[PDB]
Structure formats: C-alpha cells, structure tokens
C-alpha cells in the first residue's frame, strides 16, 4: 500500500561534557536503514539495512557531509534556543526534529512532514500545505520569522516533493523483498488463573511486520477497551514486532471472550478464543 520515509534527529547539549551530541537515524516504514552519531570515533553515515549497502561512495560521502554540517548547525540552534528562553549555560537541552514523506501505492506524494520539539515539547512545525509554519510560543515565532525571511518552507517543499519521494521509491524497489512484504502475526491465547474467582486471558501476536496492528478483546461481542491491558508494541530484534492484550475474566465465562486481530499480512482478520 502506502509507504513512508522519515529522518529523526536528536541534538543534546551537555555543558561541561563537551559539545552537543547530534544523532540522526533514517527509516523506511518500520525499518531503520541509516544512522549517524557525532560521538563516534570517525562519524559517518552508516548502513543499517542490507538494501542500502549497494549505494555508491558518492551517496555515503554526501550524506556524511550533510550530517557533519548538521552537527554544527544544530549546535548553533541549541545556543539560539537557549537565548530565546533566557536559559542559563549550565543546563542540558534537546532539539528533536522529524521530517519526511508518505507515498501511495503509485508512488505519488500523499503528504510531507517537518516537525520539531525543544525539551520534549512541540516547538515549530511545517503545515500540511508545505508553505506555512505553526509556532508553539513566542520563542518559536523567532524561528518562524527567520525561516520566513529565508524562504525555508519553500526549500522543504522542494525536498519533500522531489528528492524525498524519488529516493523513497528507489529504496522501496531495492528493498522490495522486505519493505513490500507484510509478515502476519503468529497468534495464541493463554490463560492465567488469578484466584477461584477470576483468570487472565492474554492474546499474543508475534513475528509481525509492519508494527501497525489491532488487538481487541470482546465480551459477548462488545469491545472491552476500558478493561483491556494493552502493552506497547515492542521490537523482537529480527525486524518483527510483538504485542499482547489481556483481560481479567470471571472463572467459567472464558468462552464469552473473543480476541480479534487485524494486520496487513493476514489474509483475513482473526477471531481467537481460549482453547483448553
């Protein structure tokens, strides 16, 4: 179906412990494919997916240079934001930025993104028009005015409508055997007695890709969202993800509960029950 490319930048000051660290990671969908870390012995853009390794030296040199320049640009930005908030030189602060593009099955641009945070709170974001900004506060208005004077939104739109989609389509083809393959969850239902009065039913989904999944418990055909414990979807380490959903049920009522699983890799949605 549709696909995404995203870059995630983290810039972290550390007064008294050197200059701020800059980390960048790139993803296509839920697959990380590149990394950069300014603290590395010799910082370089480095591959994290096999299908990116085929890019030539010009690609690796260009993306390394951009990241080395960004290390310096984000240090300037950390200094500027400290001033915008009247903050002392003694504290550690963090800029985060996420940007990238979504394409449909035909590869057409569906939407572009550019969003930033400071110390974990929304700071400035490019609007969906790829032409205007939303600033969170009067400090971010300073950045907005600077970026409006610089026509920075126009540079983002040019990147997002051009290079972003063009390279995403290239990656999707070069990595098609994984990036365009959905792996369905392997599912089961476990039973955990709590007392003579109740037991826990837990519905498991393992080995699935991509991470998007819906796991729900129904009692008599009605969703039990308020009473369902859902763990965060978690990585297995082999590209796939895991998740579970649990509900506490009265002993003897187990067959009134059904687990429902929706995932892109399944031929059809699953309905599971405990099977003693």
């Amino acid at each position: 179906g549709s696909h995404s490319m995203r870059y995630f930048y983290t810039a972290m000051s550390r007064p008294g412990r050197g200059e701020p660290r800059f980390i960048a990671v790139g993803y296509v969908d839920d697959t990380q494919f590149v990394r950069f870390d300014s603290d590395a012995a010799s910082p370089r853009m480095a591959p994290r997916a096999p299908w990116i390794e085929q890019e030539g030296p010009e690609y690796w040199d260009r993306n390394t240079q951009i990241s080395k320049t960004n290390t310096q640009t984000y240090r300037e930005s950390l200094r500027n934001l400290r001033g915008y908030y009247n903050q002392s030189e003694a504290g550690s602060h963090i800029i985060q930025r996420m940007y990238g593009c979504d394409v449909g099955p035909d590869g057409r641009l569906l939407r572009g993104y550019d969003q930033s945070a400071y110390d974990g709170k929304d700071y400035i974001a490019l609007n969906e028009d790829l032409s205007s900004w939303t600033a969170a506060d009067t400090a971010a208005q300073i950045t907005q005015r600077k970026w409006e004077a610089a026509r920075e939104a126009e540079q983002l739109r040019a990147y997002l409508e051009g290079l972003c989609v063009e390279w995403l389509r290239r990656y999707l083809e070069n990595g098609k055997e994984t990036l365009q393959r959905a792996d369905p969850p392997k599912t089961h239902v476990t039973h955990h007695p709590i007392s003579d009065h109740e037991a826990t039913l837990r519905c498991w989904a393992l080995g699935f890709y991509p991470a998007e999944i819906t796991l729900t418990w129904q009692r008599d055909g009605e969703d039990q969202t308020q009473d369902t414990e859902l763990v965060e979807t978690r990585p297995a380490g082999d590209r796939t993800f895991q998740k579970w959903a649990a509900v506490v049920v009265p002993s003897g009522e187990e067959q009134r509960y059904t687990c429902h699983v929706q995932h892109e890799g399944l031929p059809k949605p699953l309905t599971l029950r405990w099977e003693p």
Partner: peptide, 9 residues
C-alpha cells in the same frame, strides 16, 4: 537521502 543546507533555528 537527507535534506541538505538546513537553516539554523
């Protein structure tokens, strides 16, 4: 592919 030539904040 990364975006080049970012303006600082």
């Amino acid at each position: 592919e990364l975006r080049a030539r970012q303006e600082c904040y």
